[PDB]
Point group: C3
Chain length 160, copies 3
């Protein structure tokens, strides 16, 4: 139809030795990893929040509590797929997703297509409606010092 809605999402996680690096469902060879409840997939969290926002359904925290047994130990791709099911049942179809990863290292460009493929699979979208961008923070802040990684997302949906 013509009942479009937009949503936006943000997420950040600390970057310290000890954990694997998983961004967009992709396990990336690195010395440090992202600290969170589960995989701490900062990119999928931001996209999930953008989708809930576009549907005016709250946020990732109110749908998938860390305490909730039904999502104990679920990984962020499963959360993303459950997010999309709720978006559909509210009557919305996803038109496109765009996103940015901000990280001082490692280089993420080799893994962009893998992330796009995971996200498009999880959302049941054609590949050319999913986009992921990645850049450094020019050595500024806790991002520029490699203490964390941030993700931003935007989503467009339409009531159908």
């Amino acid at each position: 139809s013509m009942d479009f809605r937009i949503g936006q999402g943000y997420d950040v996680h600390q970057l310290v030795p000890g954990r694997p690096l998983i961004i967009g469902g992709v396990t990336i060879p690195y010395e440090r990893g992202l600290l969170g409840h589960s995989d701490a997939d900062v990119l999928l969290h931001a996209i999930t929040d953008a989708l809930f926002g576009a549907a005016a359904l709250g946020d990732i925290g109110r749908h998938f509590s860390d305490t909730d047994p039904r999502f104990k130990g679920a990984d962020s791709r499963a959360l993303l797929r459950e997010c999309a099911s709720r978006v559909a049942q509210a009557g919305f179809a996803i038109r496109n997703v765009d996103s940015t990863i901000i990280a001082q290292a490692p280089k993420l460009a080799p893994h962009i297509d893998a992330m796009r493929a995971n996200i498009a699979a999880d959302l049941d979208l054609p590949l050319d409606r999913v986009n992921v961008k990645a850049k450094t923070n020019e050595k500024l802040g806790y991002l520029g010092r490699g203490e964390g990684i941030e993700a931003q997302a935007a989503a467009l949906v339409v009531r159908e």
Copy 2:
């Protein structure tokens, strides 16, 4: 019709003693509050900027350099100027970033306030909240950030 536009907004304010904490028009009990020339409702400022941006009307600094007015009156006036340019608001989405206090119990009230100020049904307004994972000035409780996205149409 089909002349859609998007806008994006961003704001941050310092948390300081002696001021009340007002986010999305909701007074939240807390030892500190937001500093600003206005009442410093950082969430309403981000949404205001996103609405000015979507209508290509400039920004909040150019519209409201209204002395003593609160951020809801300024949001109402923002919505008036967006309508004055010929735009209708289709939806608003937003995020609050604050290490403390807990905002989850106040989200539905903020959403109700924004919908009334923008003359929008509840289901076209969304507010999200999270922490900054103890990173940077937000993670140290020194400020609270808000982000907003708005879709308008010119019919």
Copy 3:
């Protein structure tokens, strides 16, 4: 048509002595400037990213290598125009652009209308479809300390 897409962009550059300060294509008189391989125009880079992301064409680094000697000192308006040409080649028309600059200094209000005119010219848009906003970071973080300048952007396009 009705095939709408949204994109979002982010950029930051350090503010250093001995560099021109070029934001939105405007050379702003100032003792410091933005540091980058190109002219480091943080606002146009953010808008460029939003446009590539809306068209699902990747990001600015994919399209214009930030290490290639041919882009040393590159005019970021020329990069923006080539971005818009590639977005058009992918079948997309640009409907509007919104953006924000975050800086402690200098005062950008005298220059914002000129930046908007530059972006509108590069995107072949009327002025009423381009918006540039400017604010401080309320004294917080490296932005509050004047160590860099941030830009944010959003773009709506449609596949014809």
